[PDB]
């Protein structure tokens, strides 16, 4: 037979120096890692949205129970968990009337409707952030259900609800930006055509476009649908709720509270077993569909040390995508610039260069890119490149019982390639984190020298640093889980030049 090694469950540190395995238990018993004075919440949306938000806050100030307290522990209340007040009083509210929404919601062009609505919300948020004496820690956007339903890339407005026709087709707009040279005094009709073509520069995703347009202003934002908070009030034709959340009310309260606390400036938890001087980098790639060159892509890197509070660096845009292989690679100069920025940021934060640097990516590294990375790594620093992929399926079925393989079991093929099970049964929750039979992630050390068991432990630990959702563990390490989301936000607009370094603006 082939032997399986076991990787112990990574413990996470909390307040008073206490360690636990479940973020919910640690938060409930000891509280977050650091305390904040309070949360000054700002709300932009309809009046019904403000009432729903206030009701949700008043509800989460008091405990919420779940049917099964083992897998989904209860919510002891915001003040009893985080130790900071989140009051529903004194909220900076910027109303968006239903007439304003209806003015832009009934446009046939998805891009134009999304751009107009996102412009309304973003202008309200920016004006409040600039002209108000009261500073807002986190801005909460209560998006009505109609906006969420009709402002997605694949959403089509029914022909009965179309009030304003589209002045330009998608292909004609894609063939405007690159052939601007409008070069003429234009009738108002052509100026409206120009404006819609410019709206085509932005993705049709409401959330991603709002995040991209609010990045440059360093304004934290949390986007919540109306039915996420008041799902009982949103009923279908049969009388039953559209989305039944009666079994995850405690989990939803946990997730929203943790996200709001993290975005307000506080760090909930961090890794309990920290290796000093270790820096993880996540190489992230996203294709720019609006580029003249189909090979163009946007490259991003994310740096995490011991907590989820990370640093995001945006690389230059150039021909990184290789259509023959389906792999992304940076040219030497851009790779050197990205790694130099990351290492200098680490040196600024921690007063000394890291002892070990791990770069996690979804594709193998070539020799040119790796030599570029090594040319900027100090002589006293170890640089390792690791690829984590889900495309190599090794399914293990337990012989006895219906429950899957326990989380943490690993299979070491050789000194550089190994299988790790970040999904499976969890003894603490007495249940499984993934349906069917969990898929292991394939961990391969392509470049550099590093012990495989240490890399497995580090990746399992990094699985625990998801501050957007207060779940026990994720399927992927934090260095790569938010690759898709961060890439989409960065590519949602072509006007982003110097995005902020802090991670709280990207989720």
């Amino acid at each position: 037979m082939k032997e399986l090694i076991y990787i112990e469950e990574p413990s996470i540190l909390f307040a008073h120096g206490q360690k636990c395995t479940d973020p919910r238990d640690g938060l409930a018993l000891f509280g977050p890692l650091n305390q904040i004075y309070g949360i000054k919440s700002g709300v932009v949306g309809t009046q019904k949205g403000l009432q729903i938000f206030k009701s949700y806050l008043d509800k989460i100030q008091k405990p919420i129970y779940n049917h099964n307290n083992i897998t989904r522990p209860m919510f002891p209340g915001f003040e009893a968990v985080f130790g900071c007040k989140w009051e529903s009083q004194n909220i900076v509210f910027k109303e968006i009337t239903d007439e304003e929404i209806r003015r832009y919601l009934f446009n046939a062009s998805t891009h134009k409707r999304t751009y107009d609505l996102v412009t309304l919300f973003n202008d309200k948020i920016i004006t409040a952030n600039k002209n108000d004496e009261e500073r807002v820690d986190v801005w909460f956007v209560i998006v009505p259900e109609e906006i969420y339903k009709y402002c997605r890339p694949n959403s089509v407005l029914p022909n009965e609800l179309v009030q304003t026709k589209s002045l330009i087709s998608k292909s004609k707009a894609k063939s405007f930006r690159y052939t601007p040279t409008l070069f003429e005094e234009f009738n108002k009709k052509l100026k409206e055509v120009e404006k819609e073509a410019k709206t085509y520069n932005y993705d049709a995703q409401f959330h991603d476009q709002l995040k991209a347009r609010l990045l440059e202003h360093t304004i934290p934002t949390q986007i919540l649908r109306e039915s996420t908070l008041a799902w009982r009030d949103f009923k279908n034709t049969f009388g039953a709720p559209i989305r039944d959340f009666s079994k995850i009310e405690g989990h939803l309260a946990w997730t929203i509270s943790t996200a709001a606390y993290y975005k307000a400036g506080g760090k909930p938890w961090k890794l309990g077993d920290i290796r000093p001087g270790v820096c993880y980098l996540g190489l992230v790639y996203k294709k720019i569909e609006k580029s003249k060159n189909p090979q163009n892509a946007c490259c991003a890197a994310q740096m995490f040390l011991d907590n989820g509070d990370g640093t995001v660096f945006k690389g230059e845009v150039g021909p990184w995508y290789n259509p023959e292989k389906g792999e992304y690679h940076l040219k030497p100069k851009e790779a050197k610039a990205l790694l130099t920025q990351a290492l200098e940021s680490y040196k600024e934060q921690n007063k000394s260069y890291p002892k070990e640097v791990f770069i996690h990516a979804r594709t193998r590294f070539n020799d040119e890119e790796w030599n570029a990375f090594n040319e900027v790594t100090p002589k006293n620093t170890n640089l390792v490149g690791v690829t984590i992929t889900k495309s190599k399926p090794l399914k293990l079925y337990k012989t006895e019982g219906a429950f899957p393989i326990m989380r943490g079991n690993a299979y070491i093929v050789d000194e550089k390639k190994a299988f790790l099970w970040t999904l499976g049964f969890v003894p603490k929750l007495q249940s499984t984190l993934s349906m069917e039979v969990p898929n292991p992630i394939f961990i391969e050390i392509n470049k550099g020298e590093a012990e495989i068991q240490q890399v497995l432990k580090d990746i399992l630990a990094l699985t625990k640093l998801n501050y957007n959702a207060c779940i026990y563990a994720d399927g992927e390490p934090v260095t790569l889980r938010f690759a898709n989301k961060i890439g989409e936000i960065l590519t949602a607009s072509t006007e982003i030049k110097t995005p902020p370094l802090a991670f709280k603006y990207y989720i």
Binding site: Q18, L29, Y397, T399, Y411, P427, K428
Partner: protein, 450 residues
């Protein structure tokens, strides 16, 4: 000396709360007694409870809930605490904790109405702060804060059976090892004898075109029927390469590199699997770039092989268990098999829409757990076996590839305590609630079906 704090409450309900306050108080240095932490289910608890109220308790906390005001044990403990309070002349011996918003001050026992309860209803943190202020004002004994004690108690009591235990677990995989390979890999130099437009996938045995050669494990005469020009072909013109040298990495010649030979062997294994599937009369479902093979309804007696069901029903649609295989050599020479679910309307005719297939597969697999997947995969693989131990992939008239029906078994040294499957059913029911955030684009195909 009386230095303990007594928390009285209900067992099934008032359970989560007592935990928070208790741990919080013990972490702050207070010696706390509550039956959740210090009572082992099965012992006569009344004598110990009465002794702790009468002899060691300084403050008696009663959780005032709707069920707390009616539970018999809570009332008995309150009576004992009232006797002790009258004995000690300490009018603040009983400190009520109001946690239920629906508990009016008239529904609280008349003995408890006269005592100023601490408002835990609005916020548990504010109630804890009020409790700590009251305890400080009453000079309740306490030790320096030691949260490690609370953490240790939590781990010992509420995580005893919820930890990884040491026990060997044997895991069945989906890799089926290859017992043997043909002795030689042969490159028949057909040149003209092989027309440039001949599709080698139509040959009775696996073959690959490489330059002017034909790469296969089969002999020259195996293709005389389908390539009559090769009847006059000399066998000494073939380049015969040992398979063991290829697999072990000892093969080094200028004609072809070793990794190319390994890739050709992988392709030949895949082609032999395709031909074997066509020999077993299993239907084909075209995936993105590979093929999945499923069993038609009525082919197997009662749609079952070895008491394991392979074809079944799901509402108006039928589900079929299918496999898709790819050859692997590097970890070990095995035959990798992946499990699929393929749906048909009447058991024969496929469903053309891809999103219907995806949604139905997710819906059906949500309720399929480890045991179902393992049993169905093993039954399918035993359906393809020619003897009790292995399945034969024909590659020539005299050369074959032997693949075991027993998967490559894995074993680990750490296990878990198996709970009831009701937890699995609960997770199945809860999966859709989480998935309703990513599945709002597949809801139109369902209306397309109706």
């Amino acid at each position: 000396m009386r230095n303990k704090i007594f928390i009285s409450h209900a067992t099934p309900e008032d359970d989560d709360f007592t935990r928070w306050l208790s741990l919080k108080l013990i972490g702050l240095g207070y010696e706390v007694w509550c039956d959740i932490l210090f009572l082992d289910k099965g012992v006569d608890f009344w004598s110990t409870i009465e002794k702790e109220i009468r002899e060691n308790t300084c403050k008696f906390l009663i959780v005032s809930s709707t069920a707390g005001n009616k539970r018999e044990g809570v009332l008995k403990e309150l009576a004992v605490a009232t006797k002790v309070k009258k004995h000690l002349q300490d009018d603040m011996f009983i400190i009520p904790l109001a946690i239920d918003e629906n508990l009016s001050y008239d529904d609280i026992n008349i003995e408890i109405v006269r005592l100023n309860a601490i408002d835990f209803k609005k916020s548990w943190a504010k109630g804890l702060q009020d409790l700590l202020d009251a305890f400080e004002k009453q000079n309740v004994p306490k030790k320096p804060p030691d949260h490690s004690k609370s953490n240790l108690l939590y781990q010992q009591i509420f995580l005893h059976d919820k930890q990884a235990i040491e026990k060997e677990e044997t895991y069945d995989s989906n890799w089926f090892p290859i017992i043997s390979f043909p002795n030689e890999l042969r490159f028949h130099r057909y040149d003209w004898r092989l027309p440039k437009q001949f599709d080698v996938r139509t040959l009775a045995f696996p073959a690959i075109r490489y330059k002017e050669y034909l790469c296969t494990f089969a002999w020259e005469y195996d293709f005389i029927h389908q390539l009559p020009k090769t009847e006059t072909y000399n066998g000494q013109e073939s380049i015969r390469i040992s398979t063991s040298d290829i697999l072990s990495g000892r093969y080094d010649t200028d004609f072809i590199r070793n990794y190319e030979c390994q890739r050709l062997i992988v392709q030949l294994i895949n082609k032999a699997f395709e031909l074997r599937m066509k020999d077993k009369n299993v239907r084909e479902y075209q995936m993105s770039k590979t093929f999945a093979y499923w069993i038609e309804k009525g082919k197997l007696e009662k749609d079952k092989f070895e008491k394991i069901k392979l074809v079944g029903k799901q509402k108006n649609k039928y589900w079929h268990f299918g496999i898709s295989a790819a050859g692997k050599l590097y970890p070990s020479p095995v035959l990798m098999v992946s499990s699929h679910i393929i749906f048909t309307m009447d058991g024969i005719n496929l469903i053309k829409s891809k999103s219907i297939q995806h949604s139905s597969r997710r819906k059906q697999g949500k309720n399929w757990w480890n045991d179902k997947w393992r049993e169905k995969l093993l039954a399918f693989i035993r359906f393809l076996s020619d003897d009790q131990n292995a399945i034969y992939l024909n590659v020539g008239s005299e050369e074959k590839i032997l693949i075991s029906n027993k998967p490559l078994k894995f074993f680990g040294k750490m296990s878990y305590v198996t709970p009831s499957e009701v937890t699995l059913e609960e997770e199945s029911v809860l999966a859709d609630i989480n998935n309703f955030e990513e599945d709002t684009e597949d809801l139109d195909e369902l209306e397309d079906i109706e």
